[PDB]
Design a protein around this ligand. Structure first.
Ligand SMILES: Cc1cc2nc3c(=O)[nH]c(=O)nc-3n(C[C@H](O)[C@H](O)[C@H](O)COP(=O)(O)OP(=O)(O)OC[C@H]3O[C@@H](n4cnc5c(N)ncnc54)[C@H](O)[C@@H]3O)c2cc1C
Ligand SMILES: Cc1cc2nc3c(=O)[nH]c(=O)nc-3n(C[C@H](O)[C@H](O)[C@H](O)COP(=O)(O)OP(=O)(O)OC[C@H]3O[C@@H](n4cnc5c(N)ncnc54)[C@H](O)[C@@H]3O)c2cc1C
Ligand SMILES: Cc1cc2nc3c(=O)[nH]c(=O)nc-3n(C[C@H](O)[C@H](O)[C@H](O)COP(=O)(O)OP(=O)(O)OC[C@H]3O[C@@H](n4cnc5c(N)ncnc54)[C@H](O)[C@@H]3O)c2cc1C
Lengths: 488, 488, 229
C-alpha cells in the first residue's frame, strides 16, 4: 500500500512519513532511491557516500526488526522514474516522504509530486528536518529575515513550541517482497573501500549511535558548553554533526530534551549550565537558518554563492592547494586540523574556519576549490550548512567576518587551543615546542627550535606563505576588485 | 653522626642505608652529590637530568616531612672530595650508601671506601637494587651463568626468598643543618628548560608516583600481561622503568606484591593472570640479569661490549643518523617510535627493539651512535640495561638476536601493532592507510596510496634504504667482517 | 513481583500528586523498548510491555471510577453486603502493629508504618490477610491505608481493595486463602524481606520463615525463637 521513500531521514523515531504510513493501518514498503545524477554539482562526497551505505544497512536492520521484509533499494538517474517503477512492482497506492529544502530537492521533489499525481499516486510530504518550517518565521511585516539574530529570537519567541517528537511505529508490515527486487547500490570505488573503512575509527553511522551520542553529550560536555564550545583541545561539542545531516536524530527531540535540561538546571542553581543550553540551541538554530537562507534566498545566477567576489583575483596555484590538502603549510593549527579532516572526516567548527580563513585570506586560492575538498572529505557534508559556513568566513553576508583582515595565528590558538595540546596531538613532530611558539614556530629563536628538535624546512615545513606578504597581497587583490566593482 | 648518600635509590621505603642509619640511634644526614664528570661517557643525558631535578626536589620534601632539615646537595668532580668535605663540614662518624653494580660505580665506590676509611670514616654499603646479589646466584661449579634462562631459573629456585621490603623510618633526626650549606645543582641548560618541561605531559618523577604507577599496573593491565606485553598499541606494560632506574621503587616490593597477586589469582582459577605474573617477574629478572652481566663479565679491553662486531664495516653517514632521529626513515613503525621517543622520553621495549634493530640492520650505522642518542632521550637511560639491550639486538649475547638477518617490517607490525593503531597515533599522516600496507607503504599500489591520500616522497617519506639493498649490504658487510676475522 | 529488592519504579506517590507525566513515562519507556529490541535484549523488551501494563492499571482505576462509579443501587464492595465480618478492635490493633505472627504480613506492616510505602504484592498480602484471616471490615483497612500511604489514591485504592476482595470479575477469588508459603516464594523467596524488617527472625531458616508455627521446637530453638515471647 504505502511506500516510505527515505532520503535524509535515516531514522525511525519522529519520522512523520513512516509514522503516518504505519498509522494508516495498511502495508508499509520502505525504500531508498539512489539518484545522485539529480544533484549535479552536488553529487554526494566521497566520505559522505561511505556514511550513507553504513547508515542504510543500519536502518534496514532496524526496519526488519519492526516487521519489514527489507529496505528496498533502486538505482536510476531520475527519482520519479524509480519511485513510479517501485509502486508498479509493488502495486502500491501511496508514496510518503519528508521534504527537504536545498534548492535541488525543492525542485526535484515538487516535480515528483506532480509527476506521481498524474500517474494516479497519492503523495504527501512531511517536515522532519526543522523545528519550524521556514515559511512560518517572518518579520512583523511578514517578510523573510536577513540576519541570524532577529530570526533566531523570533524562533525562540514563536507562539507555539516546535512539535514534540513522534513515537516510532510499534510494528510495520509490508507483505510479500520476494518479487519486489532491490539492485545493490555502489557508494564506494573498489580502490578506496579500504581507506574508507578507517573512517570507522572515529564514527559509527546509524540512528542508534546518533541516539547514544546525544545521550552522551547531554550527560557530559553540555553543561560546560558555555565556556568550552570554542575549544578544540577536547571533545567540547556534541559531535552530532553527521547524524543530524542524515536525519538520524530528530532535531525536535534535541530541542525538547535540551529545553527540559535547561529547566532542571535553572531549578538547581546551575546558572552556567543553564546558560550553556542557550548557546547550544543557538547552534541548533544556525542549522535552522541554514535552511531558511536556502528556502528564501536561494542562489543560482544573479547572486550565486560568493557572487560578491566574482571579481576577485584568485591565485590559481594547484601546488599550494596540494600543500593545503596535505597539511604541509607550516602553520600548525592549519596543518593539525587538515590532518584530522583527512583522518576522521570531521573538524571542530572553529577549526573549520581556521583552515578555511587561511585557504582564502592567506593562500588566496579559489574558494570554490576548498569548497569541493570539504564536500569530498566531510562526513557531515551539508549543502545549506556548507553554504552558510563559507559565506560566514568570506564575509559574503552582513553577519559574516571582516574581509580585509587576517587572523593572527596566536589569536586563533589562544581561543581554540590555549595549551597547544590540539596540534601536539595531531602534529607529534611539534610535541617539544613550548606553548608560547607552538602556533607560530617561524618566529621562534633558532636556539628554541633546536631545543625542541625542530628544524624548519626538514623536520616541519616553513610557512609556505608569510602573513605580511599575504595581507599585502590582500589589499592589492581587494582594491583591484573594488576598482573592478565601481567600473561596471 | 651518619651520612646517607643517595645515588639511584631516591626513595624512602625499603632503603637499607637510610633505614639502618635511622635505627642506629644517632643523627642522620641525608645527602646527594652531583659528580657527573666521574661518569665519563656515561654522563647523564639531557632528559635523564630533567628527571633527577624533579626526583630530588620530590625526595627533599619526603625527607623533610620525616624530620629532616634538608637533603644536602653537594657539587664536585670527585665524589669522595665532596663526600669527605661533608663528613667534616657536617662532622659525621659514618657514611652509609647502597651499592650499585655498573662498571663505573663498582671501582669509583671502592676508591671511596678506602679514601673515607683513611680519614677515619666507617663505611657500610647495602643492597637496594636486586632481589639477589650477583655473587649470590651461581651454577653448580660455582661459576657465573652465561645465559639468561639458567640464571633466572636459579633465582626462582634460590633457597631463600628476596628479602621483604623494609619499612621507612618512623622519622629521621638530622640535627641542626642550618650551618651545612647545599650547592644549587644545575641540571638543565637555560635553552632547553622550556622543552624539557613538556616531558611532564607524560611523566611525573618521584617516589610517590612510582608507588601509584605500581598499584595502577597491579590492579590493571597486569592480568593481561601474558597476552598483551608485546603490543605497543595499548598501555600493556607497567611504565615503571624510569622509576626503577632511579630506585624510586623497590623491586623487592614489586616481587612480593606480584607474588601475592599470583597466589590470589591461582585460587580464583585465573590461569591466564597467573602466567601474567610469571612473565612480568621475568621482565623484572631481565633487570637483575643486566646487573649480573655488568658485574660478572664486565666490559674489558681484552674483549669490549660489541666485540663480535669489531671488523664490521659500518655505514658512516650523519645524514642517515639525522633522518633516524627525526623519524623520517619512511618505515612507519620505526618513525612512529622515533617520534614518541622524542616527545615523551619513553618507548615500549619492542619499539626499542625495532628502532635499534633498524639502526644497525638497515642503516647499519655505528651502534655507538644510537647508544648515545638513547642516552640523551630516554628518561630511564640505565647503564647496564641499555648495554644489555644493544648487546641483545646486535647478537653479542649467545642469548641474543641473530646477526645475519633482517626483520620483515610486517613481522614487527603484526606482533607489536596488529591493527596499525600505534603507527596511526604517532603518524596521523597515514591514518587513512589500511592496515594491510601501513607498515610497508612502499609496496602498496598507487591507487591504494592515492585512496589513502599518500604521495610517497612528499606527504610521507620514501624508504631511505630499501630492504633488499639493506640485506645485500649486510651480507657484504659480514663477509667482509668474516674474511677479516680469520685474517687474525 | 519480588519485595526483597528495589524491583519497581517507586514512582507511585509522585504519580498520585501528578508530579510526573504519565505521557512522558509512556513515551520514554516506548523509546527504551525500541532500542532494546534493536539490541536483541528480548527480556528487557518484555519488561517495558509489562511496566506499561502497570501504568495501564492506573489508567483503568480512573476508567472504573468514571464509567461504573460507586452508586447506592450497588456500592464498592457490594458482593460482600451480607458478609458477617469479624468486629474486633483488638485484631485491628495487632494488624496495624505488625504483631500478627505471620512474618510476611508483619514485615510489611512494619515497613508501611516506617516509610509510608509498600510493594504492590505486600499490599496484596497485608490486605488479603486482613479480609481473609482476620476477616475484619474491609472499610477499616481501607481507612488505615488512607492514613499511612504516601501515594493514597482514591481510584487506585478502590481498585486494589476491589481486586483483593473479588468484587471485580477480574479480581481475586473470594472463597480461598493463600498459603503463606505461596506468598513467600513469589515475593520473598530467600526470606530477605522478612529478615530486613523483622530482625528477630534473622536466624530462622528460609524453610519456615514464612510460617514459623510449623517449625519443630528444635529448629525454633536453634533460631532463638520462642513463639509467644
Ligand atoms: C566553512 C564551514 C563549513 C561547514 N560545513 C558544515 C557541513 O558541511 N555540515 C554541517 O553540518 N555543518 C557545517 N558547518 C557548521 C559547523 O562547523 C559544524 O556544524 C560543527 O562544527 C559540527 O560539530 P558539532 O556537531 O559538534 O557542533 P555542535 O556544537 O554540537 O552543534 C550542534 C549542531 O548544530 C549544528 N550547527 C552548529 N554550528 C553550526 C553552524 N555554524 N552552521 C550550521 N549548523 C551548525 C550542527 O548540526 C551541529 O551538529 C560548517 C562551518 C564552517 C565554518
Ligand atoms: C635497545 C634497548 C635499549 C634499552 N634501554 C633500556 C634503558 O635505557 N633502560 C631500561 O630500564 N630498559 C631498557 N631496555 C629494556 C626495556 O626496553 C625496558 O625495560 C622497558 O621497555 C621499560 O618499559 P616498562 O617499564 O613498561 O617495562 P615492563 O614490561 O613493565 O617491565 C617492568 C620492568 O622490568 C624491567 N625490564 C623489563 N624488560 C627489561 C629488559 N629487557 N632489560 C632490563 N630490564 C627490563 C624494567 O625495570 C621495567 O620497568 C632496553 C631494551 C633494548 C632492546
Ligand atoms: C489493596 C491495594 C491498595 C492499593 N493502594 C494504592 C494506592 O493508594 N495508591 C496507588 O498508587 N496504588 C495503589 N495500589 C496499587 C499498587 O500497589 C501500587 O501502584 C504500587 O505498589 C506502587 O509501587 P510502584 O510505584 O513501585 O509501582 P510500579 O510497579 O513501579 O508501577 C508504576 C506505576 O504504575 C501504577 N500502578 C502500578 N500498579 C498499579 C495498580 N495495581 N493499580 C493502579 N496503578 C498501578 C502506579 O502509578 C505506579 O507508580 C494498591 C494495590 C492494592 C492491592
Amino acid at each position: 500500500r504505502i511506500v516510505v521513500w527515505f532520503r535524509r531521514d535515516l531514522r525511525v523515531e519522529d519520522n512523520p512519513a513512516l509514522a503516518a504510513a504505519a498509522r494508516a493501518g495498511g502495508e508499509v514498503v520502505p525504500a531508498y532511491v539512489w539518484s545522485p545524477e539529480e544533484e549535479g554539482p552536488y553529487y554526494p562526497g566521497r566520505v559522505s557516500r561511505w556514511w550513507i551505505s553504513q547508515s542504510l544497512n543500519h536502518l534496514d536492520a532496524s526496519l526488519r526488526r519492526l516487521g519489514a521484509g527489507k529496505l528496498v533499494t533502486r538505482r536510476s538517474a531520475d527519482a520519479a522514474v524509480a519511485l513510479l517503477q517501485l509502486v508498479r512492482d509493488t502495486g502500491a497506492t501511496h508514496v510518503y516522504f519528508n521534504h527537504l529544502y536545498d534548492p535541488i530537492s525543492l525542485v526535484r521533489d515538487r516535480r515528483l509530486k506532480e509527476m506521481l499525481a498524474a500517474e494516479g499516486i497519492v503523495v504527501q510530504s512531511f517536515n522532519s528536518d526543522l523545528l519550524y518550517e521556514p515559511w512560518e518565521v517572518v518579520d512583523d511585516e511578514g517578510q523573510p529575515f536577513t540576519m541570524f539574530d532577529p530570526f533566531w529570537n523570533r524562533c525562540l519567541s514563536m507562539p507555539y513550541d516546535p512539535p514534540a517528537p513522534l513515537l516510532p511505529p510499534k510494528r510495520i508490515n509490508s507483505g510479500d517482497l520476494s518479487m519486489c527486487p532491490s539492485e545493490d547500490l555502489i557508494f564506494e570505488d573498489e580502490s578506496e573501500r579500504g581507506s574508507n573503512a578507517l573512517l570507522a575509527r572515529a564514527w559509527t553511522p546509524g540512528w542508534q549511535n546518533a541516539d547514544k551520542a546525544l545521550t552522551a553529550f547531554l550527560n557530559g560536555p553540555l553543561a560546560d558548553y558555555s565556556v568550552n564550545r570554542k575549544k578544540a583541545d577536547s571533545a567540547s561539542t556534541s559531535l552530532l554533526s553527521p547524524h543530524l545531516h542524515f536525519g538520524e536524530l530528530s532535531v525536535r527531540k534535541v530541542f525538547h530534551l535540551v529545553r527540559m535540561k535547561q529547566l532542571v538546571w535553572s531549578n538547581e542553581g546551575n546558572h552556567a549550565a543553564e546558560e550553556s543550553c542557550t548557546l547550544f540551541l543557538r547552534s541548533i538554530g544556525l542549522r535552522e537558518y541554514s535552511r531558511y537562507l536556502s528556502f528564501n534566498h536561494p542562489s543560482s545566477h544573479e547572486r550565486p554563492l560568493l557572487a560578491h567576489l566574482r571579481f576577485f583575483p584568485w591565485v590559481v596555484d594547484e601546488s599550494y592547494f596540494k600543500i593545503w590538502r596535505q597539511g604541509r603549510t607550516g602553520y600548525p593549527l592549519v596543518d593539525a586540523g587538515m590532518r584530522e579532516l583527512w583522518a576522521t572526516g570531521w573538524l571542530h567548527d572553529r577549526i573549520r574556519v581556521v583552515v578555511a580563513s587561511f585557504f582564502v585570506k592567506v593562500l588566496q586560492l579559489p574558494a570554490r576549490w576548498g569548497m569541493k575538498y570539504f564536500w569530498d572529505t566531510l562526513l557531515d557534508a551539508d549543502l545549506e550548512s556548507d553554504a552558510l559556513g563559507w559565506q560566514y568566513i568570506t564575509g559574503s553576508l552582513p553577519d559574516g567576518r571582516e574581509l580585509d583582515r587576517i587572523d593572527n595565528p596566536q589569536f586563533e590558538g589562544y581561543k581554540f587551543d590555549p595549551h597547544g595540546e590540539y596540534v601536539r596531538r595531531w602534529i607529534p613532530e611539534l610535541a617539544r615546542l613550548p606553548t608560547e611558539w607552538i602556533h607560530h614556530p617561524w618566529d621562534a629563536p633558532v636556539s628554541v627550535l633546536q631545543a625542541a628538535g625542530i628544524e624548519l624546512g626538514s623536520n616541519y615545513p616553513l610557512p609556505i606563505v608569510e602573513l605580511d606578504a599575504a595581507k599585502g597581497r590582500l589589499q592589492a587583490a581587494l582594491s583591484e576588485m573594488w576598482q573592478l566593482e565601481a567600473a561596471s
